[model samples]
Target: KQYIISEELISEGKWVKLEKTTYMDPTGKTRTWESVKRTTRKQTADGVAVIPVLQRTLHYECIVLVKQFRPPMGGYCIEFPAGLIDDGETPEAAALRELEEETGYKGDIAECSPAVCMDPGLSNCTIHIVTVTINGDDAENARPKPKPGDGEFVEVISLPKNDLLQRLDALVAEEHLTVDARVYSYALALKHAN
Candidate 1:
């Protein structure tokens, strides 16, 4: 019911930018929308979020999550290990590398979702959700050694897959930490699966 007329950059930042879009609705009314745009979208993908599933045995599996401070959230936030897809990097390659860099656990890509947007109405940033499997039985996987990028501080947490939703909810209440939109939605999805 609407079509875009033009988009103009409102401001530019080191890693982000602001833009205003003009649109015409079916009602023949003109409207303007403002959004935060990602400068990296032109890359194969804006970023990659890795869902690391660690398996200890045939019957035990857990999902790896991370905690980091988000100035925008004004508090600590729980999110999956993720990073921007580097130049000339495919989502798959970025997912694999980012997972290791942020969590220190190497994993094999089990599946990947197509581009998904976080704040559709607020921002143009998009990312791919990649599910990866880590062989916990392997000695190399016994101890993780995360090496986050400069200025990046990450705290890793592993939660049981069977009750991830409840566990995350408990953490949110007890720790008073914010949950990333993608992280909580994924936990809810797991609940729906059961």
Candidate 2:
């Protein structure tokens, strides 16, 4: 048991001590318990998703959206088409719809799959991946239109294969991409394409 040691105590109006206890049993080999100093709980869920769009040109620049995130990561990031999945929508449908909505270029849905994000004990979030094919004029006029009620203004960017892949490492190094979700999404999409 953890005890609270304090020096000063003043009760002019009122003071109340609220205690809470929780027991969690996970399906594993060993049993464990935890008592912490403070707990920070989230009231509402924050939904985030990723969509990778591979360019259909031999040059390798797949269709991606370059958007300006609030503070910190300013400028633009070259990433695949992606957004949160709406209610009662499958991953594939969401991916396809996002592709069209964000990027004006509409083409055949190449492939759709669920990507696994492995976290031992922190977050229990899921990711849906989608890949599509766009050629000729479609690739020229690609823009991002997030789902209904989605609030994101993205500028379309077309990258050639060599430019994107070669510069990809730079982007990663620059922290434009904090994770490999976009890369994985595009890789899987490319695999399906071939």
Candidate 3:
């Protein structure tokens, strides 16, 4: 079992953290590890997801993505519209809310994956990913625009599903944009969804 000897809040920005976790391994070895902790003002789910907008056109289908500058990373990152779940809110609801707030697109969650840790070795944070479908009457008229808050300058970018990898490669090689893991996986899924 792991015992927290002491913890200090390093910073209170987009991410929070603590360190110096003393633990007794299975072999009774005394070891210490630095752990990054996540917290919110309200009781909130660590993470939620909103996949890129899947267009419903005959000849071409587009997936809407967002590019924003992340301070810690010191570069622009391309990712899906995602955030923490509000108090008493479901991950699906949070997904929809964040999508609208960040991209101004209203859509229903087509599917949702169970919560999973993106990087357990680094941190014990988890998130749920969902496939958002914009269909029915608003499918054709749904225009995505950036409406981010909390000093986020997000740029809405849409690309054809078939062209995702190439575009990502170009962005990475030329523009030096980092693609979030989940977003990269989402792009791959979209590329093979045909």
TM-score to native of every candidate shown? 0.94, 0.52, 0.81
State each model's CA lDDT, in order: 0.88, 0.48, 0.73
lDDT of 1 by residue, 26-96 (tens): 99999999988877555746899998999998765899998999887789998999999888898999988
Query: What's the lDDT for residue 43 in model 2?
Result: 17
- Measured by lDDT, the strongest candidate is 1
RMSDs, each prediction?
1.5, 9.9, 3.2
TM-score of 2: 0.52
Ordered list by TM-score, greatest first:
1, 3, 2
Give the residue spans of candidate 3 off by over 4 A. 1-15, 41-44, 136-141, 188-194
Rank ordering of all candidates by lDDT, starting from the highest: 1, 3, 2
What is the per-residue lDDT of model 2 for residues 47-99, given as tens digits with 9 covering 90 to 100? 22334445444555554655445443544555566655666666666666666
Error of 1 at 137 (Å): 1.0
**Candidate 1 clashes between residue pairs 3 or more apart in a chain or in different chains:** none
Candidate 2's error at 53, in angstroms?
4.5
Q: Candidate 3 deviates by what RMSD?
A: 3.2
Candidate 2: list runs displaced more than 4 Å.
1-61, 70-77, 118-121, 138-150, 169-181, 184-194
